[model samples]
Target: DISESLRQGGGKLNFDELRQDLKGKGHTDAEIEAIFTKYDQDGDQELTEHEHQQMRDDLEKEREDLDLDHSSL
Candidate 1:
C-alpha cells in the first residue's frame, strides 16, 4: 500500500514525500530512512515496480505473521 501510494504520488519516490508520508503516520526520521532503504532496492533513491512488489510481499508476510500471533494468543 505504501509503495502503491508512493507510485501514485508523483514522479520517482523521493525522500521528501516518503518523509512526509511516514512522518504523518508517526514514523521517526530513523524509521523513515530504514523504510526508504528497504524499498529502494537499487539504492538509486527511487522506487521501482519490482522493489514495490518486494516490499508488498514482505509486508504481507509480516501482516500474516502478526495475524497468526494474535490468533494464537
Candidate 2:
C-alpha cells in the first residue's frame, strides 16, 4: 500500500515525494534516485496516464522486488 500511501501524501506522483516515502520505509538515497531515473524519467516526455499505469504495475510487482532489490549483506 505504499503507492496508495504516497498518493494520499501528495496530489500526484513526483520524484521527490517518492524518494522521501521510500526513504521513510528504509530505502537509501541512491536506491530511490536510481528508481527515480529508472521510472520517473524513463516513462515519457511528461507525466502520462500510460506512464502512471506502468508505474502501478511495476510498483505492484516491486512490492516484493523491493526486498529482493535492497537486501544485502
Candidate 3:
C-alpha cells in the first residue's frame, strides 16, 4: 500500500521520490498527479509524516501492512 511504502526521509517525502514509491497505484503520471494532489496536503508538493499517516488512515480500509517486525524489506 501507499502507506506501507512511505519512508521517514527526514519526516518528509518530497514530490519526486513519492512518485516512485507510489508508482504502483496510478499506473501513469497524469493519474499520479491527482493522487498526489489529494493526499499531499497543504499543496506543499510533499508528504509530511502526518500526511503519511493520513494515507494509512484513509487507505487501511482495504489497503495493507502491519506487524511485519522487520521480517524483511
Candidate 4:
C-alpha cells in the first residue's frame, strides 16, 4: 500500500525522496516501480518539466473554477 503520509503540498515527487519514503512505508521496489510506470507518461524515472507544468496548470484551472482569487499574487 502507498503511504498515507502526505508530503507538504506543491511540486511533483522528488524522485529520490519518494523512493526512500516508499521504502519506509514498506512498498517493495517492484511495487514502487509499477506505480511510477503507471503514471510516468514518458516512462522516464522522473517527471519531466513539461509534465510538472501540465499538472500545475490543471490545478490552477481547478482553483479558478473554485473562484480562488489568484489575481492578487
Query: Per-residue lDDT of 10-39 in model 2, one digit per residue for the tens?
Result: 334555555434447645556655655656
Error of 1 at 44 (Å): 4.6
lDDT of 4 by residue, 1-73 (tens): 0342344123445455455445464456666677656454444444435545665434224343435687874
Instruction: Give the 10-residue window scoring lowest on summed lDDT in candidate 3.
Output: 1-10
TM-score, predicted candidate 4 vs. hidden true structure = 0.37
Clashing pairs in 2: none
Candidate number with the higher lDDT (1 or 4): 1
Worst 10 residues of 4 by lDDT: 1-10
**TM per candidate:** 0.37, 0.35, 0.37, 0.37
Scored by lDDT, the top model is 3
Residue pairs whose backbone atoms clash in candidate 1: none
Q: By lDDT, is 2 or 4 better? A: 4
**Stretches of model 2 off by over 4 angstroms after superposition:** 6-10, 19-23, 41-73
Query: Candidate 3 on 1-73: residue-level lDDT in tens?
Result: 3353556332356566665465555656666567657655454455566655554444335345556596774
Per-residue lDDT tens digits for candidate 1, residues 27-73, read 45666567657555344443546544454434335444335355543
Judge candidate 1 at residue 10 and give its lDDT: 34
Against the reference, the lDDT scores of all candidates come to 0.49, 0.47, 0.53, 0.48
* Residue 50 in model 1: lDDT: 52
